Amino acid sequence: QSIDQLIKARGKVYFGVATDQNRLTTGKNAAIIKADFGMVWPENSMHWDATEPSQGNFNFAGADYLVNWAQQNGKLIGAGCLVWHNFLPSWVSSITDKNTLINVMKNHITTLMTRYKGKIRTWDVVGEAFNEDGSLRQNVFLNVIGEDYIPIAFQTARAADPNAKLYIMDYNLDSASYPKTQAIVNRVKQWRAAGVPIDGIGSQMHLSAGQGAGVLQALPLLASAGTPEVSILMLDVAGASPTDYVNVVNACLNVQSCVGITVMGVADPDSAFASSTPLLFDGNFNPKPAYNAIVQDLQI
Protein backbone atom coordinates (compact mmCIF):
# COMPACT_ATOMS: atom_id res chain seq x y z
CA GLN A 1 0.00 0.00 0.00
CA SER A 2 0.98 3.64 -0.60
CA ILE A 3 1.57 5.75 2.48
CA ASP A 4 0.97 8.87 0.39
CA GLN A 5 -2.44 7.68 -0.73
CA LEU A 6 -3.27 6.54 2.79
CA ILE A 7 -2.26 9.89 4.33
CA LYS A 8 -4.24 11.77 1.65
CA ALA A 9 -7.27 9.65 2.63
CA ARG A 10 -6.88 11.11 6.12
CA GLY A 11 -6.96 14.68 4.80
CA LYS A 12 -3.27 15.51 4.51
CA VAL A 13 -1.52 16.80 1.45
CA TYR A 14 1.40 14.38 1.01
CA PHE A 15 3.90 11.85 2.21
CA GLY A 16 7.09 12.93 0.47
CA VAL A 17 10.77 11.96 0.12
CA ALA A 18 14.10 13.58 -0.69
CA THR A 19 15.67 12.39 -3.96
CA ASP A 20 17.73 13.46 -6.98
CA GLN A 21 18.70 12.28 -10.45
CA ASN A 22 21.08 9.44 -9.59
CA ARG A 23 18.60 7.89 -7.16
CA LEU A 24 15.93 8.08 -9.82
CA THR A 25 18.17 6.26 -12.30
CA THR A 26 19.32 3.51 -9.90
CA GLY A 27 17.93 0.93 -7.51
CA LYS A 28 14.15 0.80 -7.21
CA ASN A 29 13.81 4.42 -6.10
CA ALA A 30 11.77 5.69 -9.05
CA ALA A 31 9.42 2.70 -8.75
CA ILE A 32 8.90 3.25 -5.06
CA ILE A 33 8.43 7.05 -5.37
CA LYS A 34 5.92 6.58 -8.18
CA ALA A 35 3.88 4.09 -6.14
CA ASP A 36 4.20 5.29 -2.59
CA PHE A 37 5.11 9.01 -2.35
CA GLY A 38 3.37 12.14 -3.44
CA MET A 39 6.01 14.82 -3.21
CA VAL A 40 9.76 15.05 -3.82
CA TRP A 41 12.48 17.36 -2.60
CA PRO A 42 16.03 17.83 -3.90
CA GLU A 43 18.43 15.98 -1.58
CA ASN A 44 21.41 18.10 -2.66
CA SER A 45 20.72 19.72 -6.03
CA MET A 46 19.27 22.96 -4.61
CA HIS A 47 22.17 23.57 -2.11
CA TRP A 48 23.79 27.00 -2.66
CA ASP A 49 27.13 25.38 -3.50
CA ALA A 50 25.31 23.12 -6.05
CA THR A 51 23.30 25.92 -7.70
CA GLU A 52 25.51 29.04 -7.52
CA PRO A 53 29.07 27.78 -6.93
CA SER A 54 30.51 31.08 -8.05
CA GLN A 55 28.77 34.44 -8.24
CA GLY A 56 26.11 34.40 -10.95
CA ASN A 57 27.28 31.10 -12.32
CA PHE A 58 24.08 29.08 -11.82
CA ASN A 59 24.11 25.31 -12.17
CA PHE A 60 20.54 23.98 -12.64
CA ALA A 61 20.98 20.63 -14.37
CA GLY A 62 20.44 18.58 -11.25
CA ALA A 63 17.47 20.55 -9.98
CA ASP A 64 15.97 20.65 -13.52
CA TYR A 65 16.12 16.86 -13.70
CA LEU A 66 14.26 16.54 -10.37
CA VAL A 67 11.62 19.12 -11.27
CA ASN A 68 11.02 17.63 -14.73
CA TRP A 69 10.79 14.09 -13.37
CA ALA A 70 8.31 15.22 -10.68
CA GLN A 71 6.15 17.01 -13.26
CA GLN A 72 6.23 14.00 -15.58
CA ASN A 73 5.14 11.72 -12.72
CA GLY A 74 2.55 13.99 -11.18
CA LYS A 75 4.35 14.62 -7.94
CA LEU A 76 4.37 17.76 -5.87
CA ILE A 77 7.74 19.47 -5.39
CA GLY A 78 9.33 21.09 -2.37
CA ALA A 79 12.66 22.83 -2.56
CA GLY A 80 15.24 24.56 -0.44
CA CYS A 81 16.98 25.78 1.45
CA LEU A 82 17.57 29.23 -0.02
CA VAL A 83 19.21 30.98 2.96
CA TRP A 84 21.11 28.96 5.56
CA HIS A 85 24.67 28.53 6.72
CA ASN A 86 25.11 25.01 5.29
CA PHE A 87 26.50 24.23 1.83
CA LEU A 88 27.53 27.87 1.38
CA PRO A 89 30.35 28.67 -1.00
CA SER A 90 33.29 30.72 0.27
CA TRP A 91 32.46 33.51 -2.14
CA VAL A 92 29.30 34.11 -0.18
CA SER A 93 30.64 33.77 3.39
CA SER A 94 33.53 36.12 2.61
CA ILE A 95 31.21 39.05 1.77
CA THR A 96 31.40 41.94 4.29
CA ASP A 97 29.41 44.74 2.61
CA LYS A 98 25.82 44.77 3.80
CA ASN A 99 24.22 46.02 0.60
CA THR A 100 26.19 43.51 -1.49
CA LEU A 101 25.15 40.55 0.62
CA ILE A 102 21.54 41.69 0.61
CA ASN A 103 21.48 41.74 -3.18
CA VAL A 104 23.48 38.48 -3.47
CA MET A 105 20.87 36.84 -1.20
CA LYS A 106 18.00 38.38 -3.14
CA ASN A 107 19.45 37.34 -6.54
CA HIS A 108 19.99 33.79 -5.29
CA ILE A 109 16.43 33.62 -4.06
CA THR A 110 14.89 35.29 -7.08
CA THR A 111 16.86 33.38 -9.73
CA LEU A 112 16.01 29.98 -8.29
CA MET A 113 12.35 30.69 -7.57
CA THR A 114 11.81 32.41 -10.94
CA ARG A 115 13.23 29.46 -12.88
CA TYR A 116 10.69 27.09 -11.33
CA LYS A 117 7.94 29.66 -10.89
CA GLY A 118 4.60 28.03 -10.41
CA LYS A 119 5.99 24.48 -10.26
CA ILE A 120 7.07 24.42 -6.59
CA ARG A 121 4.50 23.88 -3.81
CA THR A 122 6.78 24.66 -0.91
CA TRP A 123 10.02 26.60 -0.63
CA ASP A 124 12.18 26.45 2.45
CA VAL A 125 13.41 30.04 2.38
CA VAL A 126 15.31 30.33 5.68
CA GLY A 127 16.88 27.42 7.50
CA GLU A 128 18.66 26.79 10.80
CA ALA A 129 18.46 30.42 11.83
CA PHE A 130 18.36 29.64 15.55
CA ASN A 131 20.88 28.72 18.19
CA GLU A 132 20.01 26.03 20.66
CA ASP A 133 19.30 28.65 23.34
CA GLY A 134 16.81 30.32 21.01
CA SER A 135 18.94 33.33 20.06
CA LEU A 136 19.57 33.93 16.33
CA ARG A 137 22.42 32.00 14.79
CA GLN A 138 25.43 34.16 13.96
CA ASN A 139 25.80 33.12 10.33
CA VAL A 140 27.20 35.44 7.64
CA PHE A 141 23.73 36.84 6.99
CA LEU A 142 23.13 37.84 10.59
CA ASN A 143 26.73 39.11 11.00
CA VAL A 144 26.70 41.31 7.91
CA ILE A 145 23.01 42.20 7.38
CA GLY A 146 21.63 41.81 10.89
CA GLU A 147 18.26 40.37 11.86
CA ASP A 148 16.50 42.08 9.02
CA TYR A 149 17.88 39.37 6.66
CA ILE A 150 15.01 37.06 7.58
CA PRO A 151 12.22 39.49 6.72
CA ILE A 152 14.14 40.52 3.55
CA ALA A 153 14.47 36.91 2.43
CA PHE A 154 10.78 36.16 2.85
CA GLN A 155 9.64 39.35 1.15
CA THR A 156 11.97 38.61 -1.78
CA ALA A 157 10.63 35.04 -2.07
CA ARG A 158 6.95 36.14 -2.00
CA ALA A 159 7.68 38.62 -4.85
CA ALA A 160 9.49 35.96 -6.92
CA ASP A 161 6.76 33.36 -6.72
CA PRO A 162 3.57 34.31 -4.94
CA ASN A 163 2.12 30.78 -5.58
CA ALA A 164 4.70 29.07 -3.34
CA LYS A 165 4.20 28.34 0.36
CA LEU A 166 7.20 29.92 2.13
CA TYR A 167 8.75 28.16 5.14
CA ILE A 168 11.29 28.63 7.86
CA MET A 169 12.79 25.32 8.98
CA ASP A 170 14.92 24.17 11.84
CA TYR A 171 16.09 21.08 13.71
CA ASN A 172 15.89 20.25 17.41
CA LEU A 173 12.29 21.43 17.53
CA ASP A 174 11.27 17.96 18.75
CA SER A 175 10.64 18.73 22.44
CA ALA A 176 8.00 21.19 23.63
CA SER A 177 10.08 22.11 26.68
CA TYR A 178 13.28 22.90 24.71
CA PRO A 179 14.17 26.62 24.41
CA LYS A 180 14.73 26.51 20.62
CA THR A 181 11.16 25.24 20.06
CA GLN A 182 9.44 28.07 21.99
CA ALA A 183 11.85 30.61 20.52
CA ILE A 184 11.09 29.96 16.84
CA VAL A 185 7.39 30.07 17.72
CA ASN A 186 7.83 33.49 19.41
CA ARG A 187 9.78 35.03 16.55
CA VAL A 188 7.54 33.68 13.84
CA LYS A 189 4.49 35.17 15.63
CA GLN A 190 6.21 38.54 15.73
CA TRP A 191 7.52 38.41 12.14
CA ARG A 192 4.05 37.56 10.82
CA ALA A 193 2.39 40.29 12.91
CA ALA A 194 4.77 42.73 11.16
CA GLY A 195 3.75 41.61 7.68
CA VAL A 196 6.55 39.15 6.98
CA PRO A 197 5.15 36.39 4.67
CA ILE A 198 6.07 33.19 6.53
CA ASP A 199 3.47 30.60 5.50
CA GLY A 200 5.01 27.61 7.34
CA ILE A 201 7.33 26.16 9.95
CA GLY A 202 9.18 23.01 8.93
CA SER A 203 10.59 20.72 11.59
CA GLN A 204 13.76 18.88 10.48
CA MET A 205 13.27 15.57 12.28
CA HIS A 206 16.56 13.74 12.24
CA LEU A 207 15.63 11.62 15.27
CA SER A 208 17.30 9.32 17.78
CA ALA A 209 15.51 6.20 18.98
CA GLY A 210 12.59 7.00 21.23
CA GLN A 211 12.26 10.64 20.19
CA GLY A 212 9.03 10.10 18.24
CA ALA A 213 6.75 10.31 21.26
CA GLY A 214 7.86 13.82 22.16
CA VAL A 215 6.88 15.10 18.72
CA LEU A 216 3.26 14.60 19.75
CA GLN A 217 3.69 17.62 22.07
CA ALA A 218 6.27 19.54 20.08
CA LEU A 219 4.38 19.71 16.79
CA PRO A 220 1.27 21.26 18.33
CA LEU A 221 3.54 23.88 20.00
CA LEU A 222 5.00 24.77 16.61
CA ALA A 223 1.53 25.08 15.12
CA SER A 224 0.73 27.61 17.83
CA ALA A 225 2.75 30.28 16.00
CA GLY A 226 -0.26 30.63 13.72
CA THR A 227 1.36 29.89 10.40
CA PRO A 228 -1.15 28.51 7.84
CA GLU A 229 0.97 25.33 7.60
CA VAL A 230 3.55 23.26 9.42
CA SER A 231 5.40 20.24 8.07
CA ILE A 232 7.78 17.47 9.00
CA LEU A 233 10.99 17.46 6.92
CA MET A 234 14.20 15.42 6.70
CA LEU A 235 12.63 12.61 8.71
CA ASP A 236 14.65 9.63 9.72
CA VAL A 237 14.85 7.65 12.94
CA ALA A 238 17.87 5.76 14.23
CA GLY A 239 16.85 2.09 14.36
CA ALA A 240 13.61 2.81 12.48
CA SER A 241 11.40 1.57 15.24
CA PRO A 242 7.75 1.24 14.21
CA THR A 243 6.82 3.02 17.49
CA ASP A 244 8.89 6.10 16.65
CA TYR A 245 7.62 6.33 13.08
CA VAL A 246 3.99 5.81 13.98
CA ASN A 247 4.27 8.48 16.71
CA VAL A 248 5.60 11.02 14.20
CA VAL A 249 2.83 10.18 11.72
CA ASN A 250 0.24 10.55 14.47
CA ALA A 251 1.65 13.94 15.47
CA CYS A 252 1.05 15.08 11.90
CA LEU A 253 -2.48 13.64 11.98
CA ASN A 254 -3.22 15.39 15.30
CA VAL A 255 -2.14 18.85 14.09
CA GLN A 256 -4.69 20.34 11.72
CA SER A 257 -2.22 22.72 10.10
CA CYS A 258 0.35 19.98 9.45
CA VAL A 259 0.21 19.31 5.71
CA GLY A 260 2.52 16.31 5.41
CA ILE A 261 5.73 14.51 6.10
CA THR A 262 8.93 14.16 4.08
CA VAL A 263 11.42 11.34 4.73
CA MET A 264 15.17 11.71 4.27
CA GLY A 265 15.49 9.21 1.46
CA VAL A 266 14.05 5.88 0.38
CA ALA A 267 16.40 3.07 1.34
CA ASP A 268 18.85 2.67 4.19
CA PRO A 269 22.06 2.37 2.16
CA ASP A 270 21.43 5.78 0.63
CA SER A 271 21.12 7.56 4.01
CA ALA A 272 23.91 9.76 5.39
CA PHE A 273 23.29 7.64 8.53
CA ALA A 274 23.20 4.23 6.95
CA SER A 275 24.66 2.35 9.93
CA SER A 276 21.66 3.45 11.95
CA THR A 277 19.28 1.90 9.36
CA PRO A 278 16.94 4.84 9.81
CA LEU A 279 14.65 4.77 6.75
CA LEU A 280 11.56 2.89 5.71
CA PHE A 281 13.06 0.58 3.03
CA ASP A 282 16.05 -1.72 3.43
CA GLY A 283 19.05 -2.41 1.26
CA ASN A 284 17.01 -4.76 -0.93
CA PHE A 285 14.23 -2.16 -1.31
CA ASN A 286 11.76 -4.09 0.77
CA PRO A 287 9.42 -2.21 3.06
CA LYS A 288 10.65 -2.46 6.63
CA PRO A 289 8.54 -3.08 9.77
CA ALA A 290 8.23 0.72 10.18
CA TYR A 291 6.74 1.12 6.68
CA ASN A 292 4.18 -1.59 7.32
CA ALA A 293 3.38 -0.13 10.75
CA ILE A 294 2.67 3.22 9.16
CA VAL A 295 0.38 1.52 6.65
CA GLN A 296 -1.51 -0.21 9.50
CA ASP A 297 -1.81 3.07 11.41
CA LEU A 298 -3.11 5.00 8.46
CA GLN A 299 -5.64 2.35 7.38
CA ILE A 300 -13.15 7.79 16.73
Ligand X SMILES: O=[N+]([O-])c1ccc2nn[nH]c2c1
- Where do contacts with ligand X occur on this chain (CB under 6 A)? 18, 41, 80-81, 124, 169, 233-234, 262, 264
* CB-based contacts of 142, cutoff 8 Å, min separation 6: 129, 136, 149
Q: What is the DSSP string of 79-128?
A: EEEEE-STT--HHHHT---HHHHHHHHHHHHHHHHHHTTTT-SEEEEEES
Cα angle 284-288-290, degrees, rounded to a multiple of 5? 155
* CB-based contacts of 92, cutoff 8 Å, min separation 6: 48, 101, 104, 140
Q: How far is the CB of 173 from ligand X (least distance, A)?
A: 14
Q: How far is the CB of 202 from ligand X (least distance, A)?
A: 7
Nearer to ligand X, 102 or 233 (CB): 233
Nearer to ligand X, 47 or 180 (CB): 47
Q: What is the C-alpha separation between 202 and 214, in angstroms, rounded?
A: 16
Contact 86, 128 (CB under 8 A): yes
Strands (E), the chain: 14-19, 39-42, 76-83, 122-127, 165-171, 200-207, 229-237, 258-263
Nearer to ligand X, 82 or 221 (CB): 82
Nearer to ligand X, 69 or 300 (CB): 69
Nearer to ligand X, 201 or 264 (CB): 264
Q: How far is the CB of 169 from ligand X (least distance, A)?
A: 6
Contact 198, 157 (CB under 8 A): no
Residue number of the CB closest to ligand X reads 80
Nearer to ligand X, 81 or 249 (CB): 81
Q: How far is the CB of 98 from ligand X (least distance, A)?
A: 25
Q: What is the C-alpha separation between 114 and 37, in angstroms, rounded?
A: 26
Q: How far is the CB of 156 from ligand X (least distance, A)?
A: 17
Q: How far is the CB of 235 from ligand X (least distance, A)?
A: 7
